[PDB]
Write a protein that binds this ligand. Structure first.
Ligand code: FES
Ligand SMILES: [K+]
Ligand SMILES: [K+]
Ligand SMILES: [K+]
Ligand SMILES: [Mg+2]
Ligand SMILES: [Zn+2]
Lengths: 119, 53, 110, 77, 86, 168, 295, 54, 193
RNA sequence: AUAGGUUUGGUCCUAGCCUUUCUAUUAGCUCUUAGUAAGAUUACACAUGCAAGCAUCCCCGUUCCAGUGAGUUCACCCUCUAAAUCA
């Protein structure tokens, strides 16, 4: 299906069953359906902790580099996975979200302390 | 394999392209704005709230 | 060197010479019958540009693809007449032959 | 999803999307992180492009590729 | 059927009869035993010293049904059905 | 039984036993053979037995055969460059002819091995997808990973039907 | 200066290869598997001897000894410590590079811990991940229960040692702690109960001999070899012991006495061999029987 | 610097090829000129609203 | 009924009663399914015992209550495996119901996992051609300068308080749509006491 | 297909029909729970609601996704070469 314009993107295609998500990392045309035609499969991502307490991520790093070198864009969740792997720098929004959580939890410790102290 | 010509598809295409050049809207039409409702009367679309001031 | 014509080199039998500077050539390929797994000839007609009009009906010719088609159906040119009808030169010995008999003995020129 | 020809909903006629409030400190810090992040990622992308372009050339006109071509031509002759 | 079955089974050539007629060893090759050559029969008389001529292409009559099955061309909903132990 | 003499020739097993895979230069192979004469027996056997094997391995090469046009049998190959390779086959056996053309115009065993290894890389063991293309369809098949809900019901806490009820 | 032979040295390989032996009937024992109708060939004696020779060649490939490797050192290398990510995620991420054409021991497998540390995966995690993505026939992601002590004793009680070793070779890597532990435990049961014939004509005999020689307990194997009229193997075993322990009482004894053939066993029996008395009696019995047959 | 993983993979290739060096691999970001987001774009390549009037 | 062998199921197969009933033939030797036609249904019945009530023609396992399908009753399990090939007979072969065939398959696998039932264990090749552990992937990578000094990998991970002039400029741009300014974040993640 | 029933007073041959196996819809009668997958007969006509916005104005997007199977060798390979992505 020849689309008007568009570009290749490395993104997460949702698989699995209800309440059991499983993602396949694929380089696909921007306009293609999420779970439809893709150019190449570049890995997988199990977001559910396994028996060993691990979230498994597969990354075909040789082919990910090839497709980025051919002009493929990246989805935000994919950029964040590459950051956690150490292949890219940490995405700014993971840093900011980590800081937002720190501030939230620091504010939570005040009310908790006041209750135990005042009462 | 010989595709049957579609002449009306080519006629309409040329007519449309021509009309788009002869009836093209002017800058004074496109980029007008109602300063009370803050909408472009050409399309009736509101401007973003951050451009209002 | 690049050509848009699919068949680059093909051998065929000249079957018609009624068009001007165009020889109609029948080309046969062996195609596998999927059920019987036996090879049967499949034939296709090719128009070949014959600038000098030297093709005779029945001669075997080698066609080379033209860079681009010169006419609606003329996609090849006469590269060589492999066997002239009734005037075959034995490629192995280079002597004129009539079927399976030498017209000039290969021993004439040693 | 709707097409350009489908009419707009009546309920949404008067919907005005108000933009979010801006935290000055977080806003400036976040703006710089985006600039630094995208500079590093654009440098990485450039390296990956050069690698892709080098491999294509190496297969087409590389020393090993051209050596094999001559060897094959010699063996044919 | 009965008369045909007894006619065929009675006229079968044992491995010993083959070795004696051919004057050659009958060597059994089993996939479960790898390349081990298992000699099932040897010629009781003298053993020929010339190897049996190996015909490049065997001029044997093949049953289409066998060939058709080996090529995965035979679909049958009735073949290889689960049945009681016989 | 199967029709014709030597029915083995009409089996996929026999047709895949040819060892002659022409180089990409070969475009047309012409076979000139005589139907009678003892000096042409090998060429006749080569046409009877081996042309099907050669064609099966080289589907895009045109093979054309000509009977009783010359006193002696010969092969001629037309290469894409325009070179013509004449191979005289008189007095040779059909096996010798098959071996001669493999040497001069056939891909060696190394070249074929490489092509087969390139095909191996097309199918990646780690890729998950339909059985036609991949070994496993879902990660749930891998032991240790959370199993498919169709086989093992997920814990009530991991199901969205109850993630909302507990919250509200 | 003077390097002691490694397991893969040509000299050691020749000695251990001969000590193993080649029983074609044991090497190609009929496997209990899905069967097909056997094929038959009419063969001359010359052709039969050529096929038997080819079976000997194939059997020697099947018996190629696995290389004995030293226990791998635990991997504990931290690539980075992004402390900002501490507390954001509750579960660790394992990232495996699944690029096809990479040797499995040169693949980068890293773990992002909940603390934010990006560390290289441990040997155990590495092996588990390579099985998940490059599944090998006969290997399981979760360790089979057969390797527990109680279950291995059952396998030994049934004289299924070669099976235990084939299971271990498929599951664990040669330098893994589990691999070396299971192999040694099997080697120690063979020694205690004198079951050295179980591993003969298998690729696991050399490893068993190598284990015994480097731990100085070649007594049981020597006795068995003599009792079975395998002096050539017994002498070679004593010789090899001397080469791997050159500065030893027996090695010096043989040097001092220039012992050869049966003498080497006597010299070793008295000096170093723990069961010196039993060896002499066993060797005595053999030499007496041999003298009779010579007559 | 290169990010954690990429750095480790570049250093491993050095050691594998035999090159023994302690220099740090680093990305040359001097070529990348990050312009502000409000830098005037090219008006020649920009489109125009269509004729449909309200 | 209550069989006395549930605790030691292997005993029944060595008792006199078993030898009188079965002898040396497998327990399923005499069973015959009742079905219409010459070709039987390709599945056996789901279960021979429904709500503690046995059907008319109980399968070989369900007709004898003393036969216990247990991973330890190796002699009973062996009867349901091919001695020459080692494959577990499919249920139509012996006539066991689907319920008992599933239990038999699980017990056979458990016995094989525990080493009680012998099965063909093949000799496999090594996973790796080379066993060297010298590559950086498995060795120790030289620590990066930032890791040695304890700094963040990139300087922009850390929060740097913006200058006051820039904050005032943002406060003019977003007049009337401003949040409370946020200072530097906590140095580490707090925790609920 | 491992086959079976059926021509005749009877036998043999040939032959069609049907039986036994496995699925999918619909109908009758009947039906406890959980998880999962799947789910108009009709390219017939459609009440009502919703399904495309975003954004300091310009542009961009609404040409996608989603739907259907009416029509029907435009789908694949090669040659050549636009638009598009690689700031
Ligand atoms: S198929 Fe894997 S979760 Fe259902
Ligand atoms: K009938
Ligand atoms: K916009
Ligand atoms: K249709
Ligand atoms: Mg362009
Ligand atoms: Zn039952």
């Amino acid at each position: 299906k020849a689309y008007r314009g568009g570009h290749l993107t490395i993104r997460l295609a949702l698989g699995g069953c209800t309440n059991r998500p499983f993602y396949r990392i694929v380089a696909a045309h921007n306009k293609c359906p999420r779970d439809g035609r893709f150019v190449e499969q570049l890995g997988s991502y199990d977001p559910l902790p396994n028996s060993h307490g691990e979230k498994l991520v597969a990354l075909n790093l040789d082919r990910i580099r090839h497709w980025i070198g051919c002009g493929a864009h990246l989805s935000k969740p994919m950029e964040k996975l590459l950051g956690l792997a150490g292949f890219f720098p940490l995405h700014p929004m993971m840093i900011t979200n980590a800081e937002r959580l720190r501030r939230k939890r620091a504010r939570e410790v005040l009310l908790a302390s006041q209750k135990t102290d005042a009462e | 394999k010989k595709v049957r010509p579609r002449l009306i598809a080519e006629l309409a295409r040329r007519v449309r392209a021509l009309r788009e050049q002869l009836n093209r809207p002017r800058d004074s039409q496109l980029y007008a704005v109602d300063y009370e409702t803050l909408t472009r009367p050409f399309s009736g679309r509101r401007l973003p709230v951050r451009a209002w001031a | 060197v690049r050509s848009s014509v699919h068949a680059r080199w093909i051998v065929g039998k000249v079957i018609g010479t009624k068009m001007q500077k165009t020889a109609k050539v029948r080309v046969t390929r062996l195609v596998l019958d999927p059920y019987l797994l036996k090879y049967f000839n499949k034939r296709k007609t090719y128009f070949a540009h014959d600038a000098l009009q030297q093709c005779t009906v029945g001669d075997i010719v080698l066609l080379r693809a033209l860079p681009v088609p010169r006419a609606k159906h003329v996609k090849h040119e006469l590269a060589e007449i492999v066997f002239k009808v009734g005037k075959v030169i034995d490629p192995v010995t280079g002597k004129p032959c009539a079927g399976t008999t030498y017209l000039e003995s290969p021993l004439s020129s040693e | 999803r709707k097409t350009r020809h489908d009419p707009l909903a009546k309920s949404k006629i008067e919907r005005v999307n108000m933009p979010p409030a801006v935290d000055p400190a977080e806003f400036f810090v976040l703006m710089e992180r985006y600039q630094h992040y995208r500079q590093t990622v654009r440098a990485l992308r450039m390296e990956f492009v050069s690698e892709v372009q080098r491999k294509v050339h190496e297969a087409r006109a590389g020393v090993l590729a051209e050596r094999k071509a001559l060897k094959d031509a010699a063996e044919h002759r | 059927l009965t008369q045909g079955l007894f006619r065929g089974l009675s006229r079968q050539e044992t491995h010993q009869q083959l070795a004696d007629k051919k004057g050659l060893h009958v060597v059994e090759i089993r996939e479960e035993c790898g390349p081990l050559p298992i000699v099932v029969a040897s010629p009781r008389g003298p053993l020929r010293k010339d190897p049996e001529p190996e015909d490049e292409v065997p001029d044997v009559k093949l049953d289409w049904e066998d060939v058709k099955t080996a090529q995965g061309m035979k679909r049958s909903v009735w073949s290889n059905l689960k049945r009681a132990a016989t | 039984p199967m029709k014709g003499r030597f029915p083995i020739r009409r089996t996929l097993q026999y047709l895949s036993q040819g060892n002659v895979v022409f180089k990409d230069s070969v475009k047309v192979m012409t076979v000139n053979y005589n139907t009678h004469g003892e000096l042409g027996e090998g060429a006749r056997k080569f046409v009877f037995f081996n042309i099907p094997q050669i064609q099966y391995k080289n589907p895009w090469v045109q093979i054309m055969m000509f009977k009783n046009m010359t006193p002696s049998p010969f092969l001629r190959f037309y290469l894409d460059s325009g070179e013509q390779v004449l191979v005289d086959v008189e007095t040779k056996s059909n096996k010798e002819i098959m071996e001669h053309i493999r040497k001069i115009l056939g891909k060696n065993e190394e070249t074929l091995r490489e092509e087969e290894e390139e095909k191996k890389q097309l199918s990646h063991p780690a890729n998950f997808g339909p059985r036609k293309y991949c070994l496993r369809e879902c990660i749930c098949e891998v032991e240790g990973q959370v199993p498919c809900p169709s086989l093992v019901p997920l814990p009530k806490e991991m199901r969205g039907k109850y993630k909302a009820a507990l919250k509200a | 200066e003077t390097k002691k032979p490694t397991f893969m040295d040509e000299e050691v390989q020749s000695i251990l290869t001969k000590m193993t032996g080649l029983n074609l009937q044991k090497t190609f024992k009929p496997a209990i598997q899905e069967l097909k109708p056997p094929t038959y060939k009419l063969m001359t004696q010359a052709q039969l001897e050529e096929a038997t020779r080819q079976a000997v060649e194939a059997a020697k490939v099947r018996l190629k000894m696995p290389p004995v490797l030293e226990e791998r050192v635990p991997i504990n290398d931290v690539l980075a410590e992004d402390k900002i990510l501490e507390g954001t995620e509750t579960t660790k991420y394992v990232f495996t590079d699944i690029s096809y054409s990479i040797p499995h021991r040169e693949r980068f497998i890293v773990v992002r811990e909940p603390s934010g540390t990006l560390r290289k995966a441990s040997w155990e995690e590495r092996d588990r991940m390579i099985q998940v993505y490059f599944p090998k026939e006969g290997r399981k992601i979760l360790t089979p229960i057969i390797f527990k002590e109680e279950n291995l004793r059952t396998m030994y009680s049934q004289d299924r040692h070669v099976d235990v070793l084939n299971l271990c070779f498929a599951q664990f890597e040669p330098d893994s702690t589990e691999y070396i532990k299971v192999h040694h435990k099997t080697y120690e049961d063979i020694d205690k109960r004198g079951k050295y014939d179980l591993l003969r004509s298998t690729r696991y005999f050399g490893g068993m001999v190598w284990y015994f020689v480097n731990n100085k307990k070649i007594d049981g194997l020597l006795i068995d070899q003599i009792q079975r009229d395998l002096i050539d193997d017994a002498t070679n075993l004593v010789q090899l012991y001397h080469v791997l322990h050159p500065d030893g009482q027996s090695a010096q004894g043989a040097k001092d006495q220039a012992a050869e053939g049966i003498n080497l066993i006597k010299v070793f029996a008295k000096t170093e061999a723990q069961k010196g008395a039993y060896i002499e009696l066993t060797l005595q019995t053999y030499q007496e029987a041999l003298s009779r047959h010579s007559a | 610097p290169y990010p954690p993983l990429l750095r480790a993979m570049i250093i491993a290739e050095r050691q594998k090829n035999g090159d023994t060096s302690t220099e740090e691999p680093m990305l040359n970001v001097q070529r990348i000129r990050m312009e502000p987001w409000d830098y005037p774009a090219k008006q020649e390549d920009k489109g125009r609203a269509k004729g449909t009037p309200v | 009924p209550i069989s006395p062998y549930k605790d030691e199921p292997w005993k029944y197969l060595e008792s006199e009663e078993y030898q009188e009933r079965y002898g040396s033939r497998p327990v399923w030797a005499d069973y015959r399914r009742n079905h219409k036609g010459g070709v039987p249904p390709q599945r056996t019945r789901k279960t021979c015992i429904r709500r503690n009530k046995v059907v008319g023609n109980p399968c070989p396992i369900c007709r004898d209550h003393k036969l216990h399908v247990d991973f330890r009753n190796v002699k009973l399990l062996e009867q349901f495996v091919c001695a020459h090939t080692g494959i577990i007979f499919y249920a139509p072969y012996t006539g066991v119901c689907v319920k008992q065939h599933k239990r038999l398959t699980q017990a056979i696998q458990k016995a094989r996992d525990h080493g009680l039932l012998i099965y063909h264990i093949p000799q496999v090749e090594p996973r790796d051609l080379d066993f060297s552990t010298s590559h950086g992937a498995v060795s120790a990578t030289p620590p990066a300068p930032t890791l040695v000094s304890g700094d963040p990998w990139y300087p922009w991970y850390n929060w740097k308080q913006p200058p006051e002039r820039e904050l005032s400029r943002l406060r003019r741009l977003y007049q009337g749509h401003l949040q409370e300014e946020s200072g530097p974040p906590p140095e580490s993640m707090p925790k609920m006491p």
